[PDB]
Design a protein around this ligand. Structure first.
Ligand SMILES: Cc1cc2nc3c(=O)[nH]c(=O)nc-3n(C[C@H](O)[C@H](O)[C@H](O)COP(=O)(O)O)c2cc1C
Ligand SMILES: Cc1cc2nc3c(=O)[nH]c(=O)nc-3n(C[C@H](O)[C@H](O)[C@H](O)COP(=O)(O)O)c2cc1C
Ligand SMILES: CS(=O)(=O)CC[C@H](N)C(=O)O
Ligand SMILES: O=C(O)CCC(=O)C(=O)O
Ligand code: F3S
Lengths: 1472, 105, 105
């Protein structure tokens, strides 16, 4: 994959611009899935100017006369198999161009060579044809495209009405034309020779290859699109899409004249995310806005409220943000309206984008940098884009604008501020009334009874509400979610329970809402929905909150300011009502809001307030959706704000759902109440009820910001109404009828059930007195109502069983377990088969089976050292495997002990904060598990409370003692699937023997990703259930993120099968598997391996008391405390017994089924039948979609060979060859080689080899040194141990020294480059990610997230993008230059100095955990000096040398950045 | 000639004469289906052949007829699935005795 | 074109004896050549066997091609075995008809 762009700064056309454009496209394949087929690829494209010589001649050769104007071309994909349709297609195409009365010189079959296409693709190949049009009407450049635009839509539309498939017009303008198709980019020129003609000349270029979650090639989905080309993904798409359904309700501009209606819907079916973007971007530009304005209105930069930003810009930004809600997601963009050409970034700089400027007056935009030869000699600059920036060219004036200067320009266009000043911030007005006193008007006798209506409890009040009020933070907890899944529940659960928060896995990264809160946002606006098409100050006239969240005080504040303008709808219904009560209720509300809005109303207030003994409340969630949708469905939502008052609301989740299913504003009124009551028994102590709410509110605000970040979304306006949930349990019909689009893969209950349950709980609370809520056993087993998997009896019996070693006791446990009411989906399945039973002896053996079992990754830290190694011993004893876990593994452990026991773990993880990740760690295993996610907390990343960060722990992890370890939610080197792809490459490079796994978490859509993972060379894929365990994690994720494995595991099984990849990868699953049958059923759904954690913990003794986060483990399982660790009685022997039983119980089952082995039953879903009905009312689920087979009946067999999906060599292949002496004799060596952007992970293999023979540190620095001219591609020197040194004279791309491990890497411009070392980029992003040792020197600037997570590498570099030194925990980080926003966020431990010539660092640095001072003590001043010296010595850097020359005056200019938590720890204090 | 069959790339449409621009689209006539390098086929030979019927046994059961001139009675079952029964017999008979050389029956 | 790594490997540093040259010069050469995967030549006069291992720094003083010349200087079962190539020296262009000299001092 890649996007790129090239432009002649002067405006004047040239052939090189195209030849370069090709040139690029020939250097991106190293980033894609190569087929063994040699031909097949996902899509490539080049968007250049229609070449009028070339075309005109053509018209001449047929013997017409060339017009004076520009001649248009339509580039069109016609149906290729039904001639009947091609015609219809061409009549339509002609008719439409005809009624604008332009002129047709006529069709031209494009030459192409289909030999380089694969069949898959030739299959879906359309018939590519050009049609040539002339501007007989003598209109203007601008009018021609305008008209053509209305024409293309007209066609587009008619073909649709005709119901014609496969028709598609890539381009149709007289300025630009697009040559895209499904073929390898390196072969664009081959599939389309026109491109090789010298008449193809152009002032600009835009190329783009693409990847996918598929095996299927659609042609129209290859880019570049008509104005756009996008690298990344736009996670905020459904959000955007539904907004346009309303934005459109009002869009009207005069340029389209009477055409608008043909103009809508601007977004047709079947578009890829980027495709939809181009769609919007286009209309906007067709109506007048420049390119750069549009990048902004749609992919605006973050308005951090800071000095970093001039005030013009801020105005503008604020303007946009008020018109259009962003289109978020990682995004490198290459854009152009007719005149300008733009390179742009998303608001988080999520994708690479280097660029070079030449003496010849060209700018070449890129994704990597070595992408197209240019002589250093003619380089005038070497830049990049950072979050939010753009760079551009105005081709009419042949002027280049860098970000500042370009943004300057746009600020210039209008009185942004004067206009912005037109908004009413009703904030202060609202805060005022709060301080004036958050009221409360119910008597406990009430609170209690309503509360009972929504089935609330003490656990609810104590466990969850309280901490919010107190700490202003939400409840953290531990252990998995073992309760039933709500539909199956026995006990009133509220709608919000069935909506699961979505989150993101490999497609895009989730953000850090702590360390990166400045880019996020919760602004809310009522009435800012008018004409995205307009550009007038009247667009700022709207009210603005700063949180959709309102305390009963603030709420009324607002509701008053509104007034005649608001309308209140009664979200409630009679109980005397009848079977259809709630239905008609839902109609009613729907209608009433209609009338209101029509009637003139501008704000709606939906509410349960009139709930009483005679009226049940309509589930706020359902009521909000029913309303918002119908509002959209009638083009009305654009006229109001929709505000909800809810008695049932209480936690963060409930807000999130409400908001994103419509809600503008929410007020949890009966909870502020419940807060008060608590407060008048002084449960909060001294603290005023007002400060009370304040906190509550922050907890819910950060609440949301988080839930959002789980699918990288930075901003509530795009999130709102986007329906980002997945419904488990409610009926298809329903979810469709009333909420935005969401999946509900098995219908579930419907209104009639909902009604019945709502009312039942109701009687509970108005049928008689209520002094206390029940206790509740949702977050914990009480011997009360809610059941759980793990309950006391069950735990005892199991313990009894593995301790006394009786299989009979085991069997009694599992029976205890299997005889209950259904609690989980698998519980609803029976296993029946058609074979007679077989004798048990005959089945496969335990030895055999237990080997398919593994003990999941549970970190050293989360668990006691004793527990951890216990597990490693058990697994190795039975020839199985265990998983180190998120947090290091002690290397002493790399040998078997006198007793023969083996503490080393067989599968090592690799997770966001790269904990103990070392060349030697990565090499002490058979398998690497890339942890993208756990079912306990999908969107997010580990926690390890500070008081667990023992010293041993801290030593392991290179973290700082007793300081907390919260991990970055996303991996920093996996922002998109190609990214995954490359990590897997490095992984397979540093360790030639291991298989690589990807931990993913079930959720709908996993299937597809699963595929991409497969194309990315992963060997195993593991789908984790929503219910798995965690040692520490917020409770909403434990109860609301994730989906059951029975759904995700089949989806992966299916989809992978459906694309013929299912044999390329092995499948594993975990999530609550405690029993023989749980394991058989998982096999039949497709699994080959099963993970067993918690139950293995319980055998080691866990009693499931849930204080894993607390460091108070009654039993030594999950606690670092010494005394407490002495109460541990786990034993290998115990765990081994657990597995032994499990397998035997598996064999017992297979025999009954007639199979003599597990393999004979994988995928065999025909052996499972869904029985269970388990409720009073006819409310059933559809378990089909899970049981279905893709290619039922006999399967063909693809031979799979034993081993791992192998990978292509790199430079290391030769380097190693050339190093015989090294390994053979010990010699020292110096090698030289060139290097291209296309060579990845250079050295890594070397390193693996060296680490293996001499170990990370048995070689003295520089022992083997390899100079490289040119460009290093991603992962340069990744995991290099000491002894290796790489000099890259030239430059590099992302991830230099990723996981650096005591090796050394240096990078400087070519002796001959005339560039000013420090005023130019030289290495990409996420450099030194997670390093632990070694040095890195860089004559130049580095890009975003430099030194992220560095845990002990020393570096020197002349500058650095934003988010630098983030989450750093060790090492020294010098920095000869300016530094990006948010520097040092979360930087708990190492040190960075920072030459700052403008005393600006103050404006950029992230205070929170760090401080800066000028050097005072002189050993710190000396430390710096020596590095800088080294730097120079290695890099021959002038600018550096000079700082050395004036040390005296200069030292004065730096700034010591030192972590708070390091102040008292530091041998030599930092101060005098 | 072979080197050029189907090669429409060798024909361009100039259609000119004296009138108003009212032109035809001769493209649909000229387009290639799978343009660009062709596979090479060897000379396919003979005729699309077809399945035997009962006649392939009657003839076998009839050696004496064709070899010695004998007169024969053959018995067989027949199904709606067997077509043109007798026609190949006829061909053989016609060729060796002509349509009228053998006495009826 | 082919790479330097590749090409430089076709280069070698001739045999110049320990004696004719300083010990420092001699081993310098052996180190250079082994560093770039090429070959050096011991020369007419022995090679010290200590030199038969790479040193703490990774440098390798041992020479890859050992000579064998008239006065068999250091010619030993172990010398002959510490290499990839044996060079029978029948003659040098400086003095074809003749054979080395090493002044007594
Ligand atoms: C205490 C504990 C620690 C865990 N630590 C990690 C970890 O370090 N890395 C990880 O990728 N998943 C971790 N997990 C999840 C497990 O690896 C596995 O996905 C899940 O534990 C199994 O769920 P089950 O508990 O119902 O047996 C942890 C889970 C628990 C309960
Ligand atoms: C100082 C010196 C020492 C030499 N010693 C030997 C030697 O020991 N054995 C040998 O076979 N040739 C010897 N030669 C010759 C070289 O091995 C090689 O044949 C010739 O040096 C290369 O000539 P060129 O000097 O113009 O580079 C010696 C030459 C020189 C200059
Ligand atoms: C190379 S790419 O993975 O960024 C593809 C971009 C986009 N989401 C698409 O589906 O086309
Ligand atoms: O130990 C750690 O860093 C993480 C452990 C963890 O996140 C979990 O077990 O839920
Ligand atoms: S608190 Fe974790 S619950 Fe198990 S580990 Fe101790 S009993």
């Amino acid at each position: 994959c890649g996007v790129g762009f090239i432009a002649a700064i002067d405006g004047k056309p040239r052939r090189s611009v195209v030849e370069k454009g090709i040139e690029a496209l020939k250097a991106v394949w190293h980033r894609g899935a190569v087929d063994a087929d040699g031909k097949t690829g996902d899509g490539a494209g080049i968007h250049v100017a229609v070449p009028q010589k070339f075309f005109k001649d053509h018209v001449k050769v047929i013997g017409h006369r060339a017009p004076d104007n520009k001649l248009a071309v339509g580039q069109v994909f016609l149906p290729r198999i039904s001639l009947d349709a091609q015609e219809a297609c061409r009549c339509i195409v002609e008719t439409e161009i005809l009624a604008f009365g332009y002129y047709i010189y006529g069709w031209r079959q494009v030459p192409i060579n289909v030999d380089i296409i694969g069949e898959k693709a030739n299959a879906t190949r359309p018939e590519i044809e050009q049609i040539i049009v002339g501007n007989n009407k003598g209109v203007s450049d601008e009018q021609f495209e305008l008209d053509l635009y209305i024409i293309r839509r007209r066609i587009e539309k008619a073909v649709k009405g005709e119901q014609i498939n496969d028709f598609y017009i890539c381009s149709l303008s007289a300025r630009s034309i697009i040559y895209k198709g499904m073929f390898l980019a390196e072969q664009l020129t081959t599939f389309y020779p026109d491109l090789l003609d010298e008449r193809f000349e152009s002032d600009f270029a835009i190329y783009h290859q693409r990847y996918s979650t598929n095996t299927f090639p659609t042609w129209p989905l290859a880019q570049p699109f008509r104005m756009l080309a996008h690298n990344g993904e736009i996670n905020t798409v459904k959000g955007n899409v539904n907004w346009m359904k309303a934005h459109e309700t009002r869009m009207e501009h005069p340029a389209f004249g009477t055409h608008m209606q043909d103009l809508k819907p601007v977004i047709g079916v079947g578009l890829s995310d980027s495709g939809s973007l181009d769609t919007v971007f286009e209309v906007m530009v067709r109506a007048g806005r420049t390119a750069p304005m549009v990048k902004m209105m749609l992919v605006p930069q973050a308005l951090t409220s800071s000095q970093t930003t001039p005030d013009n810009h801020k105005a503008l930004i604020q303007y946009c943000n008020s018109v259009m809600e962003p289109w978020d997601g990682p995004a490198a963009l290459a854009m152009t309206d007719g005149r300008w050409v733009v390179g742009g970034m998303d608001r988080n700089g999520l994708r690479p984008m280097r660029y070079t400027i030449t003496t010849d007056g060209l700018i070449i935009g890129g994704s990597e940098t070595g992408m197209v030869k240019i002589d250093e000699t003619q380089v005038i600059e070497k830049g990049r884009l950072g979050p939010g920036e753009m760079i551009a060219v105005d081709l009419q004036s042949g002027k280049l604008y860098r970000d500042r200067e370009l943004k300057d320009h746009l600020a210039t266009l209008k009185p942004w501020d004067k206009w912005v000043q037109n908004t009413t911030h009703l904030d202060e007005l609202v805060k005022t009334a709060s301080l004036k006193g958050e009221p409360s008007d119910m008597d406990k006798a009430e609170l209690r009874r309503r509360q009972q209506a929504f089935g609330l409890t003490m656990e609810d009040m104590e466990l969850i509400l309280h901490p919010m009020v107190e700490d202003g933070k939400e409840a953290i907890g531990s252990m998995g979610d073992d309760s039933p899944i709500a539909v199956l529940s026995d006990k009133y659960r509220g709608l919000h329970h069935f909506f699961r928060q979505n989150f993101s896995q490999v497609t895009n990264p989730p953000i850090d809402s702590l360390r990166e809160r400045r880019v996020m946002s919760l602004k809310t606006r009522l009435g800012n929905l008018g004409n995205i098409l307009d550009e007038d100050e009247t667009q700022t006239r709207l009210l603005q909150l700063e949180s959709p969240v309102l305390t009963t005080a603030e709420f009324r504040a607002m509701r008053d300011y509104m007034g005649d303008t608001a309308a209140e709808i009664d979200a409630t219904f009679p109980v005397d009502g009848g079977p259809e009560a709630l239905r008609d209720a839902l109609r009613r509300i729907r209608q009433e809001t209609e009338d209101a809005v029509r009637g003139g109303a501008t704000h709606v207030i939906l509410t349960d307030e009139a709930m009483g003994p005679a009226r049940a409340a309509i589930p706020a969630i359902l009521a909000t959706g029913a309303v918002h949708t119908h509002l959209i469905r009638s083009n009305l939502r654009t006229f109001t704000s929709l505000n909800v008052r809810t008695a049932e609301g209480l936690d963060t989740h409930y807000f999130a759902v409400l908001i994103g299913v419509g809600a503008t504003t929410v007020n949890a009124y009966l909870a502020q109440e419940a807060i008060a009551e608590r407060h008048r028994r002084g449960l909060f102590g001294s603290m005023p009820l007002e400060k009370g709410m304040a906190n509550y509110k922050k907890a819910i605000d950060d609440g949301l910001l988080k839930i959002m970040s789980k699918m990288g979304i930075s901003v509530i306006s795009s999130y709102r109404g986007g329906g980002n949930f997945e419904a488990i349990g409610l009926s298809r019909a329903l979810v469709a009828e009333h909420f935005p689009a969401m999946v509900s893969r098995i219908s579930g209950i419907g209104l009639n059930g909902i009604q019945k349950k709502v009312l039942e709980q109701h009687a509970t609370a108005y049928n008689e007195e209520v002094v206390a809520l029940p206790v509740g056993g949702f977050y914990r087993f009480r011997k009360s109502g809610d059941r759980h998997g793990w309950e006391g009896g069950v735990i005892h019996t199991l313990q009894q069983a593995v301790t006394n070693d009786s299989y009979t006791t085991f069997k009694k446990y599992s029976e205890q377990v299997n005889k209950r009411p259904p609690m989980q989906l698998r519980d609803l399945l029976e296993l029946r088969s058609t074979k007679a039973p077989v004798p048990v002896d005959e089945v496969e053996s335990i030895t055999a089976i237990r080997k398919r079992f593994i003990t999941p990754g549970m970190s050293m830290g989360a668990l006691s050292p004793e527990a951890h190694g216990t597990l490693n011993v058990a697994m190795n004893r039975i020839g199985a495997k265990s998983d180190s876990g998120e947090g290091g593994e002690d290397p002493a452990r790399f040998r078997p002990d006198k007793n023969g026991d083996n503490w080393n773990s067989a599968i090592k993880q690799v997770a966001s904060g790269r904990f103990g990740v070392t060349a030697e760690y990565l090499n002490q295993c058979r398998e690497l598990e890339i942890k993208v996610a756990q079912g306990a907390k999908p969107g997010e990343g580990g926690q390890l409370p500070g008081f667990k960060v023992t010293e041993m722990i801290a030593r392991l992890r290179h973290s700082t003692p007793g300081v907390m370890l919260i991990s970055p939610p996303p991996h920093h080197d996996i922002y998109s699937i190609e990214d995954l792809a490359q990590l897997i490459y490095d992984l397979k490079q540093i360790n030639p023997d291991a298989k690589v796994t990807v931990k993913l978490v079930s959720r709908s859509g996993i299937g597809t990703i699963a595929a991409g993972v497969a194309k990315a060379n992963a060997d195993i894929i593991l789908i984790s259930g929503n219910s798995g365990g965690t040692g520490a994690s917020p409770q909403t994720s434990i109860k609301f993120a994730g989906l059951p494995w029975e759904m995700g595991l089949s989806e992966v099984h299916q989809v992978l099968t459906l694309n013929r990849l299912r044999h390329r990868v092995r499948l594993r699953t975990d999530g609550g598997l405690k029993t023989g049958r749980d394991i058989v059923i998982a096999a039949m759904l497709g699994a080959e391996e099963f993970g067993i954690g918690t139950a293995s913990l319980i055998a080691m003794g866990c009693i499931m008391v849930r204080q894993c986060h607390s460091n108070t483990c009654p039993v030594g399982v999950c606690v670092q405390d010494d005394k407490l660790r002495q109460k541990f009685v786990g034993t290998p022997e115990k765990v081994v017994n657990l597995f032994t039983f499990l397998a035997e119980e598996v064999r017992e089952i297979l025999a009954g089924l007639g199979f003599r082995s597990l393999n004979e039953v994988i995928g065999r879903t025909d052996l499972l039948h869904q029985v269970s009905r388990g409720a009073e009312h006819l409310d059933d689920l559809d378990l089909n979609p899970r049981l279905a087979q893709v290619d039922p009946g006999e399967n063909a067999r693809y031979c799979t060979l034993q081993g791992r999906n192998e990978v292509p060599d790199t430079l290391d292949a030769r380097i190693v060859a050339d190093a015989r002496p090294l390994f053979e004799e010990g010699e020292k060596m110096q090698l030289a080689y060139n290097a291209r952007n296309t060579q990845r992970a250079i050295g890594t293999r070397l390193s693996s080899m060296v680490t293996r023979k001499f170990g990370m540190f048995g070689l003295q620095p520089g022992h083997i040194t390899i100079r490289l001219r040119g460009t290093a591609g991603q992962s340069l020197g990744a995991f290099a141990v000491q002894g290796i040194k790489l000099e890259v004279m030239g430059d590099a791309n992302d991830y230099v020294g990723k996981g650096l491990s005591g090796g050394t890497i240096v990078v400087r411009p070519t002796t001959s480059s005339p560039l000013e070392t420090n005023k130019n980029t030289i290495i990409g992003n996420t450099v030194l990610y997670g390093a632990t040792a070694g040095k890195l020197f860089a004559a130049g600037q580095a890009g975003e997230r430099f030194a992220v997570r560095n845990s002990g590498a020393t570096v020197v570099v002349e500058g650095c993008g934003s988010n630098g030194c983030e989450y750093m925990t060790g090492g020294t980080a010098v920095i000869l230059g300016r530094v990006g926003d948010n520097f040092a966020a979360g930087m708990t431990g190492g040190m960075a100095y920072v030459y700052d010539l403008d005393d600006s660092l103050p404006l950029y640095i992230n205070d929170e955990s760090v401080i800066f001072q000028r050097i005072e003590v002189g050993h710190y001043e000396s430390q710096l000096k020596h590095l800088i010296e080294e730097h120079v010595t290695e890099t021959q850097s002038r600018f550096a040398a000079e700082i050395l020359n004036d040390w005296a005056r200069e030292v004065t200019k730096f700034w010591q950045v030192v972590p708070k938590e390091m102040l008292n720890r530091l041998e030599v204090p930092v101060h005098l």
